[PDB]
Ligand binder design. Structure first.
Ligand SMILES: [K+]
Lengths: 271, 121
């Protein structure tokens, strides 16, 4: 096993470049497949329309086009298995139970497969009485997990990605600085939304008042994104735009130097 | 498109810009790499969280990737915007993540450039 770990974690060889390739090629695949759930179907069309004898048999077509995911399911089925083979070999290492020190790499590893594997059983997510009472039309568990889970897949990269190890160490040890940013942003967002509220709705049709909608504008305007989906034709929000946008950059710039500094010592380090 | 570049023999700034980049590749390579991870992630959630109610930012991942890159660099062309509620957090967390990640490889490239510009001068 002191010779399989040469094949396993540590040394730099062929198997490491293949795994990263499976990840990348895999990500590209799922991406494209999720796009047109229905293949080559948008084009010349028709339906249940009374105009003449035509609507009668509506050209639904009896032999139209093949519908298939086997090879991509192959991308997922084969990846999860190599994940488990190796991870299962990675047990021929050293084990324990926790949730802190052990290995976030192993947790992230298991977190991508266990969902797809799970999803294949029709259901077993009897969660809450009121919800389970009638799982009826509800794919809720599948709704929650299936997408969060696959979204998570990318992360795994970080064992073959030093930058991610560096990005991680910063964040995990830079939490209070980051926690302040979002906290400050919260206070800012709330405040800057409540004034525009008091100052806009008098004349008609402007940025929909109701606070959780003016909160979108506030966050956006600051981060200085300004999607232009919310904009006021009015005069009262004019100052707010100014004071808010100014406040954004001020508050946003604040927790930057620290996180950056941490990252500089950490990146400079493993290097 | 390439023609412009030639200028750099009569353009010192370009000689300076070059030396930085050519010797600052790993720092720049990380930025785009981080941005990649960010872009992908932040696109896949909005996907899972938007298309339920109709007509919002066209789901298909290589289209939500446009939005993600844009929103971060904080360009926000407004060509992609969601009338919905689920992407509300994403907008927040994404835009925040953009500035964080973008600001990261700036100080290094800038520093290199400062020593190089200060130098031929
Ligand atoms: K800036």
């Amino acid at each position: 096993l002191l010779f399989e770990y040469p094949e396993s974690s540590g040394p730099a060889r062929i198997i490491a470049i293949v795994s990263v390739m499976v990840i990348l090629i895999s990500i590209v695949s799922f991406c494209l497949e999720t796009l047109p759930i229905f293949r080559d179907e948008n084009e010349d069309m028709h339906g249940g329309g009374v105009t003449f004898h035509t609507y009668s048999q509506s050209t639904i077509g009896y032999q139209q086009s093949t519908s298939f995911t086997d090879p991509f399911f192959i991308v997922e089925t084969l990846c999860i298995i190599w994940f488990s083979f190796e991870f299962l070999v990675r047990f021929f290492a050293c084990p324990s139970k926790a949730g802190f020190f052990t290995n976030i790499m192993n947790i992230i590893d298991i977190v991508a497969i266990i969902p797809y594997f799970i999803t294949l059983g029709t259901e077993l997510a009897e969660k809450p009485e009121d919800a389970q009472q009638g799982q009826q039309a509800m794919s809720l568990a599948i709704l929650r997990v299936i997408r969060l889970v696959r979204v998570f897949r990318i992360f795994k990269l970080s064992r073959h990605s030093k930058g991610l190890q560096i990005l991680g160490q910063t964040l995990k040890a830079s939490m209070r600085e980051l926690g302040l940013l979002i906290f400050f942003l919260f206070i800012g967002v709330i405040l800057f939304s409540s004034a525009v509220y008091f100052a806009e709705a008098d004349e008609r049709d402007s940025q929909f008042p109701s606070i959780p909608d003016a909160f979108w504008w506030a966050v956006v305007s600051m981060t200085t994104v300004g999607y232009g989906d919310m904009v006021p034709t009015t005069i009262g929000g004019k100052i707010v735009g100014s004071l808010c946008a100014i406040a954004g950059v001020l508050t946003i710039a604040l927790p930057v130097p620290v996180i950056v500094s941490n990252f500089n010592y950490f990146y400079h380090r493993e290097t």
